[PDB]
Amino acid sequence: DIIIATKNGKVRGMQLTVFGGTVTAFLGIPYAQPPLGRLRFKKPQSLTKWSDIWNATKYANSCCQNIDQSFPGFHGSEMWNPNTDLSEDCLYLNVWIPAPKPKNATVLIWIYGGGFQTGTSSLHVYDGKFLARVERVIVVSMNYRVGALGFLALPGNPEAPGNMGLFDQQLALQWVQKNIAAFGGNPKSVTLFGESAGAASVSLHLLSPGSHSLFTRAILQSGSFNAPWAVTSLYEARNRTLNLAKLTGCSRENETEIIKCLRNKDPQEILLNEAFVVPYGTPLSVNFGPTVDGDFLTDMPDILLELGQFKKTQILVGVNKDEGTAFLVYGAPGFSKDNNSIITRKEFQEGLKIFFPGVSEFGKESILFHYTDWVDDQRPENYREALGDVVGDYNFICPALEFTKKFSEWGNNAFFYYFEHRSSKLPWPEWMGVMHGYEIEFVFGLPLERRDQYTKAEEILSRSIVKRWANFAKYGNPQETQNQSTSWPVFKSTEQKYLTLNTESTRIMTKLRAQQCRFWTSFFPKV
Ligand SMILES: *[C@@H]1O[C@H](CO[C@@H]2O[C@@H](C)[C@@H](O)[C@@H](O)[C@@H]2O)[C@@H](O[C@@H]2O[C@H](CO)[C@@H](O)[C@H](O)[C@H]2NC(C)=O)[C@H](O)[C@H]1NC(C)=O
Ligand SMILES: CN(C)CCNc1cc(-c2ccncc2)c(-c2ccc3ccccc3c2)nn1
Ligand SMILES: *[C@@H]1O[C@H](CO[C@@H]2O[C@@H](C)[C@@H](O)[C@@H](O)[C@@H]2O)[C@@H](O)[C@H](O)[C@H]1NC(C)=O
Ligand SMILES: *[C@@H]1O[C@H](CO[C@@H]2O[C@@H](C)[C@@H](O)[C@@H](O)[C@@H]2O)[C@@H](O)[C@H](O)[C@H]1NC(C)=O
Ligand SMILES: *[C@@H]1O[C@H](CO[C@@H]2O[C@@H](C)[C@@H](O)[C@@H](O)[C@@H]2O)[C@@H](O)[C@H](O)[C@H]1NC(C)=O
Ligand SMILES: *[C@@H]1O[C@H](CO)[C@@H](O)[C@H](O)[C@H]1NC(C)=O
C-alpha cells in the first residue's frame, strides 16, 4: 500500500505494471470545492481538509459537456468523447509518479483541448503512466470546466465573472505547488503542456500574473491564445450570456437575478442551448471561451504579446501538417470520411461560407484568390486540399508561428516543430493526412507499447519525442543527445528555423508557410 499525506489529508493510489516496471497512479484527487448550487459559474473555492484516506484509485467525473454524435460508433470521433460520467462535480486531477518514488523529479502538467467546450483528462491518449515510467517525470493532469459552465461571462460581476475554467486550471497548478513535493516532485521544475485549446490555455498562463510563479516552462501543441477562436471579446461574450438567458427564459433586468435563474437550471437545459447563443456558427465556434475578465487576463492578449508582457522562459511550440482537415467533415459540402472528397470550385466557394460566415464577399474572394492559383490546375484534389490548408493555416499554423516570432523577440529560447507523420493506426481516411490531435499519442508514448499494433518506426519516433519533450521539461532544451540525432535549433525571428518530426527523416527547415501566413497575419485581419 502507498499513502501520501497532502495538505488536505491522506490519499491512497494504485500500483501499475508498466514495461516490466512500476508506476504509482493517483487518479481523481479533488482540488477544489465542487462548483455546485450557489457555486455554479463562480471561481473555484478552495478545499476543506478531510481526516480519512481518500481512495484516488479511479478517474473521476468529467465536467459537463455536449458530446460529438456526428459519427456514432466510429472510433475516430468517439475516442475523444468523455470516458467517465459527466457531472458538475468534476474539479479533480491525476498524478503519475515513478516507482520507486523519486526525490526531486521534474513535473509535467497536461491541459487538454476541445475548443473550451469539450475534453477530459481521463482519455486513453492522455495516460501519463508511460512518461512516468520511461523518463521518470511526474505527470499531472486536471479536469477544468468547459462551455458556459466554465466560461459564461458578465464582466465585473463575480456571480459570473468569466474564465472560471482557466481559474480551475490555475487552482490545480497551485495544488501542485503546495503538494507535489510529498509525491517526490520538484515544484521548482514544472512544465505545462497542452494541445489545441489546452495549448491556448498554456499560452494564457504565460500572460496571467497569477500564474507566473506556478510553473517554469511551457509547451504549446497546435494552439495559442492569438488564434482567432481563442479569446472572445467582451461585447459578444455579453451578447452570448444574454442570448442564453433569453433561451432559458432567464431574462431579468438585475443582471445578478439572471445568474440566480441560470443557477436553478438543470445542467442539461444550459448545455442544450449553448449552440444558439451565436447568430452564425462554424465547426470552430467557441460559444463560451476565455475573455478579458480583468482578473485572470488584464488586457487584450494580443497587446500583451506585442508589448512583451509575459513570463520570460523557454517555449516549445509546434503544429501538425494537416491541422485543418478534421473540421471539413463536420459541415463542408462534398466532404466525407467515407470517400476521397474530391470537391469542385463551387463546392470550395460554398465551403468558405461555412468557415467564414460573417466575412465580406471580398474577404471570401481574397481567400479563394490566394489558395487557388495552382501549378497543375488539373490536379483533382486541388480544391479539397486548398480548403483544408485554408482552415489549418488560418486557425492553427499561422497564429502559432506568429506567437513564436513575437515571444522570441524578447530574448527567450523558442523551439518550433512541424509534425508530419500520419499514424499507422489512424482511423480517419488518407486524404485527411496528419490530423489535428494525432501527435498526442506520440507525445505520451503509446507507440512504446509493442503490444499496441504500431510499427517499429513509430516506436522509435515516439521514443525520441518523449526524450525531447522531457529534456525540454527538465533542462529547457529539447535535444536527444545520444542516438546521433538532429540538433533542434532555437527559433529566431530573422531566420525562423524549425524541426520536422517523422519516421523518415528529421530535418531543419526555415520559414514555415511563409507565403500563406503573410496573407493571414497581414492582409486578411483588415477585411
Ligand atoms: C462523398 O460523399 C459526400 C457525402 O455523401 C455521404 O457519403 C457518401 C459516402 C454516401 O453514403 C452518401 O449517401 C452520403 O450522403 C457526397 O456529397 C453529397 O453528394 C450528393 C450527390 O452528389 C449531394 O446531393 C449531397 O448534397 C452531398 N452532400 C451530402 C452532405 O450528402 C459526395 O458527392 C461524395 N463524393 C465523392 C467524390 O464520392
Ligand atoms: C484536439 N483534439 C480533441 C482532437 C479531437 N477532435 C476534435 C473535434 C472537434 C469538433 C467536434 C465536432 N464538431 C466540430 C469540431 C473539436 C473542436 C470543437 C470546437 C472548437 C472551437 C474552436 C477551435 C477548435 C475547436 C475544436 N476539437 N477536437
Ligand atoms: C478505500 O480503499 C480501502 C482499501 O481497499 C482498496 O481500495 C478499494 C477501492 C478496493 O479496490 C480494494 O480492493 C482495495 O484493496 C478500503 O478498505 C476502503 O473501504 C475504501 N474506502 C472508500 C471510502 O472507498
Ligand atoms: C447579438 O444578439 C442579437 C440578439 O438576437 C438574438 O440572438 C441571435 C443569436 C438569434 O438567435 C436572434 O434571432 C435572436 O433574436 C443578435 O441579433 C445579433 O446578431 C447578435 N450579434 C451581434 C454582433 O449583434
Ligand atoms: C536509442 O536507441 C536504442 C536502440 O538502439 C541501440 O542503442 C543505441 C543507444 C545505439 O547504440 C544503437 O546503435 C543501438 O542499436 C533504444 O533502445 C533507446 O531507447 C534509444 N534512445 C532514445 C532516447 O531514443
Ligand atoms: C530540489 O531542488 C531544488 C533546486 O531545483 C533545491 O533548492 C531543493 O532544495 C531540492 N529539494 C529536494 C528535497 O531535493
Ligand SMILES: *[C@@H]1O[C@H](CO)[C@@H](O)[C@H](O)[C@H]1NC(C)=O
Ligand atoms: C440584485 O439583487 C440582489 C439580490 O437580491 C441585490 O443584492 C442587488 O443589489 C440587486 N441589484 C440591482 C441592480 O437591482
